[PDB]
Design a protein around this ligand. Structure first.
Ligand SMILES: [Zn+2]
Ligand SMILES: [Zn+2]
Lengths: 240, 240
């Protein structure tokens, strides 16, 4: 209950995984998205704690393409998006789920969550937290590891915001989501041509909240829309 | 059948996914790898067709960390490896599954495989095939997309091999695996520190063979070994 209260204090609109998948699949079914004709894609952190969300959508839409990497950025990039587009069922569409993530503990502390078989869970999101430390310290001072370098690069503009935050562990996944949303939008704008005529791309973006094992995880929806083959938005389902 | 003949012709030692998981789990159980104390990690291509292998090992060892990206290279890098190591159950170990992959069609043609809801399946591995084309064409003339650039980079040493190949589609996954094995070894040598004392890293590396839907997928084991927290190889299970 302390955890759940903390979740809803920071994010009053947060949905359980079950609520999210039910809502998204119900809405998209009105627009012709079904199992046979939808290709699922995710851009979520490589951390094992993010797997339940992929599994919950995969029960609906089947095996998914991954475009993510550390902290959930779409490191698959243009080539990854094109690979995905090239696998969409004929006359069908893609559903992309992306976001940052953050752990919240049994005592409602953000930025950490208990991990299986460990007494100390450590940071969640680990990549984002390490990156935030590096960019804020450098700010306050007024391919072997290329991904983590990119995470620092994309987090650098938020250094002031992070340093001034009341709770940096809540502000961090919001900033990471903002950086992701920009990059995803750029990729979709560039790889627009790869979607065939009638085909669409539905997008769900937000913040994944990883809770202790006895609890459902949660998701904060910040983007839920459909774009056409020409890169144009044709439906916006926000706000919920 | 035609597909199975092609598979065994080029890869006599290929195992079905079921055979692979049975063999690996049986062997590692003799070395104390069980569900409660093992953290599963993969470095496989972002392509949706590679998911069954993750699911099959996931049934035994649970939710996995991902390290992969385009063509299955360990793009998570040092930070990704450290993130994984920091989540290993106390006193437990990691199991890393990595590999290239390749499609084989109902007609026994390499480098392609039928995809759900599609008349044309396109390349498999798409990323590797595109990279191969680029580096062999360049040879024969004697963040937005950084991963594919890295794939081209790591395949460049193999340009002569690929251009001389009798069937480049059957040679390509072997070259990709060779490039992967070097990078994985480098990451494990660097991030050895992150494993604590008694903890080990078990490694399975090879070539994932993606077959038509009515058929089992296969895997060609090229590496199956155990390393200790100091980076030393303590067991080598090859050849099977
Ligand atoms: Zn993370
Ligand atoms: Zn691939």
């Amino acid at each position: 209950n302390v955890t759940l209260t903390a979740v809803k204090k920071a994010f009053p609109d947060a949905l359980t995984n079950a609520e999210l998948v039910a809502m998204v699949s119900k809405r998209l079914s009105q627009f012709g998205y079904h199992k046979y004709n939808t290709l699922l894609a995710t851009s979520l952190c490589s951390d094992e704690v993010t797997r339940p969300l992929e599994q919950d959508f995969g029960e609906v839409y089947g095996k998914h393409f991954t475009m993510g990497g550390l902290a959930g950025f779409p490191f698959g990039g243009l080539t990854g998006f094109g690979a995905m587009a090239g696998a969409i069922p004929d006359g069908g569409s893609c559903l992309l789920i992306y976001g940052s993530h953050v752990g919240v503990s049994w005592e409602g502390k953000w930025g950490t969550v208990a991990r299986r078989g460990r007494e100390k869970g450590g940071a969640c999101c680990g990549s984002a937290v390490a990156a935030a430390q590096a960019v804020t310290q450098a700010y306050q001072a007024t391919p072997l590891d290329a991904q983590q370098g990119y995470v620092r690069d994309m987090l650098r503009p938020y250094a002031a915001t992070l340093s001034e935050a009341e709770d940096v562990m809540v502000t961090l996944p919001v900033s990471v989501y903002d950086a992701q949303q920009k990059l995803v939008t750029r990729i979709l704008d560039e790889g627009s041509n790869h979607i065939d005529g009638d085909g669409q791309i539905a997008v769900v973006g937000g913040i994944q909240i990883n809770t202790p094992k006895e609890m459902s995880d949660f998701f904060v929806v910040r983007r839920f829309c459909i774009r056409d083959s020409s890169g144009n938005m044709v439906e916006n389902f926000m706000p919920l």
